[PDB]
């Protein structure tokens, strides 16, 4: 997984959400983006994972909202086995405040498949409060 | 146009005399914006009036205005030798931004 | 400060077009609420608004005037230029460039310049 | 201005009210009617602005 991008009419006429998790950078930016039927960041000679096409949004209007925030624990390269790792997010919409809860967990025991059954909190990572109505977004990974 | 003005009036220095421009008021409308220049000859025309008994920075307290159902009366008090020139109304208009007022010049002895 | 001064022609031929400018200096007529418009007054009789136009584009005419008139700006030499058609012998007039507002209609105005008919 | 300002907006026409707190705005066409509207408006089409 790399990062999500999200708007409502896939054509930089309508402000939309940026959210990039590719090496260091985690940046929010509110602003129109033209969006296709199939951005896609993964594909790289099919074995090395890279977040090729980084320019999946083509254009923009108009720009309000930008932060910065660290990134978070992940691995590098690509392979196949041993999934230690899991991730758990929550996305809420409130009066138009998007907020979001994460928890992220290594080295669970139990097998693939499997849903653990250890209890576990998710302390509050962000909300953003940009005001529109959400029904369509979709994560793009790398 | 449909805007009329007199154009001559006279009076004695150092007393108060009056002039008036009047219309109609459909045209002009409620809203009067009612504003007076004055033009002595051989220079541009400025600004002494430009809203409902009022006056710009660079004053002459002997100007005043004052804006009836219907006309707009401009009044001056202590006169001197520079009345003797041309005195323009002029007023917003519904149909036309158009004011075409004769002016009004002045006399004195 | 501001001073406006018009240019042009004093002499016409009534077959031939007019053209006039009004070199502003003092404003940039870019800010966003003034405007700035055209007054003649024929010799012996009232004034005569001819048009005006905005900061942001937006060009008013007279109503009788509009295809006899025509209106241009150049922010960059400051600069408006305005042409005159098939003008008439009850045409020629005493022309100024003034500043335009919203509340004080008029505020300063150019010197300006006689324009008459003839051979 | 004295001729008139028509740079502003307001919007007319929507299918239902909207949530608290929403700023997009769709510049799409509208029907009003139950015929199918397309390319540009007139009859039960109006202008959603
Ligand atoms: C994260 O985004 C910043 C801002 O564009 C960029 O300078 C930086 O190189 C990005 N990090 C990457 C590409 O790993
Ligand atoms: C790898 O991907 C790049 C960009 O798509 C392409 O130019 C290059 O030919 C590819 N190489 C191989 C070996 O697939």
């Known amino acids: 997984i790399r990062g999500w991008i999200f708007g409502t009419t896939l054509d930089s006429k309508t402000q939309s959400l940026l959210i990039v998790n590719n090496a260091t950078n985690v940046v929010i930016k509110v602003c129109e983006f033209q969006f296709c039927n199939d951005p896609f960041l993964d594909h790289k000679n099919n074995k090395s994972w890279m977040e090729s096409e980084f320019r999946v949004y083509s254009s923009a209007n108009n720009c309000t909202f930008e932060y910065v925030s660290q990134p978070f624990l992940m691995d590098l390269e690509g392979k196949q086995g041993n999934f230690k790792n899991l991730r758990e997010f929550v996305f809420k919409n409130i009066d138009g405040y998007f907020k979001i809860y994460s928890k992220h967990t290594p080295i669970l025991v139990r097998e693939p498949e499997d849903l653990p059954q250890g209890f576990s909190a998710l302390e509050p990572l962000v909300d953003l409060p940009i005001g529109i109505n959400i029904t369509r977004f979709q994560t793009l990974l790398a | 146009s449909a805007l009329t003005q007199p154009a001559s009036v006279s009076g004695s220095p150092g007393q108060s005399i009056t002039i008036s421009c009047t219309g109609t008021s459909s045209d002009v409308g409620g809203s009067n914006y009612v504003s007076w220049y004055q033009h002595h000859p051989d220079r541009a025309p400025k600004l002494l009036i430009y809203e409902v008994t009022n006056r710009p920075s660079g004053v002459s307290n002997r100007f005043s205005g004052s804006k009836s159902a219907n006309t707009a009366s401009l009044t001056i008090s202590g006169l001197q030798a520079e009345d003797e020139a041309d005195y323009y109304c002029?007023?917003?208009?519904?149909?036309?931004?158009?004011?075409?007022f004769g002016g009004g010049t002045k006399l004195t002895v | 400060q501001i001073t406006l001064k018009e240019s042009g022609p004093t002499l016409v031929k009534p077959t031939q077009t007019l053209t006039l400018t009004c070199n502003f200096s003092?404003?940039?007529?870019?800010?966003?609420?003034?405007?700035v418009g055209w007054i003649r007054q024929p010799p012996g009789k009232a004034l005569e608004w001819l048009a005006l136009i905005y900061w942001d584009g937006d060009e008013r005419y007279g109503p009788f005037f509009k295809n006899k008139v025509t209106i241009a700006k150049d922010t960059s030499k400051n600069q408006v230029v305005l042409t005159m058609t098939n003008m008439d012998p009850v045409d020629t007039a005493t022309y100024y460039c003034?500043?335009?507002?919203?509340?004080?209609?008029?505020?300063?105005w150019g010197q300006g310049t006689l324009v008459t008919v003839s051979s | 201005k004295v001729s008139g300002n028509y740079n502003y907006l307001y919007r007319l026409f929507r299918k239902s009210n909207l949530k608290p707190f929403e700023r997009d705005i769709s510049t799409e066409i509208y029907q009003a009617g139950n015929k199918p509207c397309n390319g540009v408006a007139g009859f039960n089409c109006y202008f959603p602005l």
């Open positions: 003092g404003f940039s007529l870019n800010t966003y609420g003034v405007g």
């Open positions: 003034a500043r335009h507002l919203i509340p004080t209609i008029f505020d300063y």
């Open positions: 002029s007023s917003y208009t519904t149909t036309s931004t158009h004011i075409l």
